[PDB]
Design a protein around this nucleic acid. Structure first.
Lengths: 58, 257, 58, 127
RNA sequence: UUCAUCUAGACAGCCGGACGGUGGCCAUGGAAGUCGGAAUCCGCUAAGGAGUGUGUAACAACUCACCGGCCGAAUGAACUA
């Protein structure tokens, strides 16, 4: 997903996963901003260990 | 053959326009490669875009640079080595290496050359009649006469990578008919667009990126499954997590329903 | 990594190259791109079906 | 390779075939047949034929060749009687004739381009 | 002193490379790089001469030309006193 890929790149670069930072990467890609989808995404990512989730999975 | 140029400043002048005509400029090593092999290798390049001349007349990339705005001086340490050419091309950097570096032709090693890789000689009958077996023994190849033929006792490494091959060593190997290396235009270097690439880059991984891609793909996939964020790939798994976890509470416990 | 996520994100949108997008996304991240890393990823990408590589997951 | 000399149409000469050894790796008049069949028209100037030997086979590297190709096209057997100026016989090859000789040569020749190949044959033709 | 070669890198030495038009007409027992005797273009092109010497009856290799590097600053040939 463009939104999931944007989150993993933002964490790899060392920058926080928020609405501004996702919006700038999303705009550079050329994909239109949709308020609901990045807002859910930041909310889903809230309270998470990105590192611990990333590795297990079937 | 006579004294007449044998040009100076004239062939440089043709060469001047040649770096400027083409985007991508390579610094390349013929030394090893035979010329049916080089000349064939060059046939490939030539259809696509072409190679031209120098000594120190080559090192004069500076004049070419001076005409434009690109390098001087500024380059890391001018990488040129014995036996260098320039390849001027349309062809992007990465592809040029795969043509040249992958497709090399074979040929024999040489006396006084540094071995590029480990050299071994096999055990079995040489097929040769009694004579100076001693020459083989001198190198540290054990041989003995079995069945009236010279045979090599065992497989062993005669020379390692990064050590020079002795003059005796080379000659004796050639008589055995043992060769083995890959020859073609070793790439020392690349210029494109203000950027300098050395040879480590130029062997261009790629399998590692597949693994990293698939792992990146799994990071995304993982994030997707666990997170619950339902565009096309993730969805059926995300629903399953909310069960995986219920079905699950049953297994440890000891209420039966 | 930065590079991997950036081309993946673009692939989801459906399009990519050196200056136009790869450079644009990482620059949108606010990070300075190493050219050698972009060049290596692109050279590797040529003649590859990204969708097929994804279909086995590893 | 270990090389040899030949005349058009020759077989079985004592001096040329016997001491140089009979290819086929034995049994001359194997090769003596093979060279002779191939040789073409009247003897003229000697050609190289070049010997390569394999297990119970002989093979020869024979180029009279691209110039013998010129002879066929022109319908003129000699070569340039009065060198580089003007020939005694009037063998002017056409431009269409020379590119077709170049087409056929292009495998044997290295040449990059067909236009490159036309120079190489033309340079041979003039002299 | 006179003529040539040198920072576009000479020079002493050491190191290193060579595919293709194609083994070229005359004559002769026989020249085919190299006994005698022609023209001399070109590919591609770091570069790869229809060839410098060493050969066999004749053919039969290997080097050199031409070209590249390690070093860095002058250089050698002719005459004259």
């Amino acid at each position: 997903s463009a939104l999931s890929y944007a989150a993993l790149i933002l964490a790899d670069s060392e920058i926080e996963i928020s609405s501004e930072k996702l919006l700038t990467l999303t705009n550079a890609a050329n994909v239109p901003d949709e308020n609901i989808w990045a807002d859910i995404f930041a909310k889903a990512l809230d309270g998470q260990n990105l590192k611990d989730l990333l590795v297990n999975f079937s | 053959m006579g004294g007449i140029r044998e040009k100076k400043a004239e062939y440089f002048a043709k060469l001047r326009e040649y770096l400027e005509e083409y985007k991508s400029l390579f610094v390349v090593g013929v030394d090893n490669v035979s010329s049916q092999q080089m000349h064939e290798v060059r046939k490939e390049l030539r259809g696509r875009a072409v190679v031209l001349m120098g000594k120190n007349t080559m090192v004069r990339r500076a004049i070419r640079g001076f005409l434009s705005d690109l390098p001087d001086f500024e380059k890391l340490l001018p990488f040129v080595k014995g036996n260098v050419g320039f390849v001027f091309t349309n062809e992007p950097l990465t592809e040029i290496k795969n043509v040249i570096v992958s497709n090399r032709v074979a040929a024999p090693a040489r006396a006084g050359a540094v071995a590029p890789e480990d050299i071994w000689v096999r055990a079995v009958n040489t097929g040769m009649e009694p004579g100076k077996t001693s020459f083989f023994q001198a190198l540290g190849v054990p041989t003995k006469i079995a069945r009236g033929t010279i045979e090599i006792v065992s497989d062993v490494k005669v020379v390692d990578a990064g050590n020079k091959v002795g003059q005796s060593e080379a000659s004796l190997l050639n008589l055995l008919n043992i060769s083995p290396f890959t020859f073609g235009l070793t790439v020392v270097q690349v210029y494109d667009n203000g950027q300098v690439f050395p040879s480590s880059i130029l062997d261009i991984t790629d399998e590692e990126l597949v693994s990293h891609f698939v792992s990146a793909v799994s990071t995304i996939a993982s994030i997707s499954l666990a997170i619950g964020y339902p565009t096309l790939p993730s969805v059926g798994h995300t629903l399953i997590n909310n069960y995986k976890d219920l079905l699950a509470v049953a297994i440890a416990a000891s209420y039966h329903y | 990594m930065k590079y991997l996520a950036a081309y993946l994100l673009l692939n989801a949108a459906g399009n990519t190259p050196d200056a136009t997008k790869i450079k644009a996304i990482l620059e949108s991240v606010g990070i300075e791109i190493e050219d050698e890393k972009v060049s290596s990823v692109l050279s590797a990408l040529e003649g590859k079906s990204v969708d097929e590589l994804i279909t086995e997951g590893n | 390779y270990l090389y040899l000399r030949a005349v058009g149409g020759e077989v079985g000469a004592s001096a040329a075939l016997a001491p140089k050894i009979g290819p086929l790796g034995l049994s001359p008049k194997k090769v003596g047949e093979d060279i002779a069949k191939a040789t073409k028209e009247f003897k003229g100037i000697k050609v190289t034929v070049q010997l390569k030997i394999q297990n119970r086979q002989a093979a020869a590297s024979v180029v009279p060749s691209a110039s013998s190709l010129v002879i066929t096209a022109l319908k003129e057997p000699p070569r340039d009687r009065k060198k580089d100026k003007n020939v005694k016989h009037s063998g002017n090859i056409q431009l269409d004739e020379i590119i077709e000789i170049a087409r056929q040569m292009r495998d044997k020749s290295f040449g990059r381009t067909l236009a490159s190949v036309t120079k190489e044959i033309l340079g041979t033709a003039q002299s």
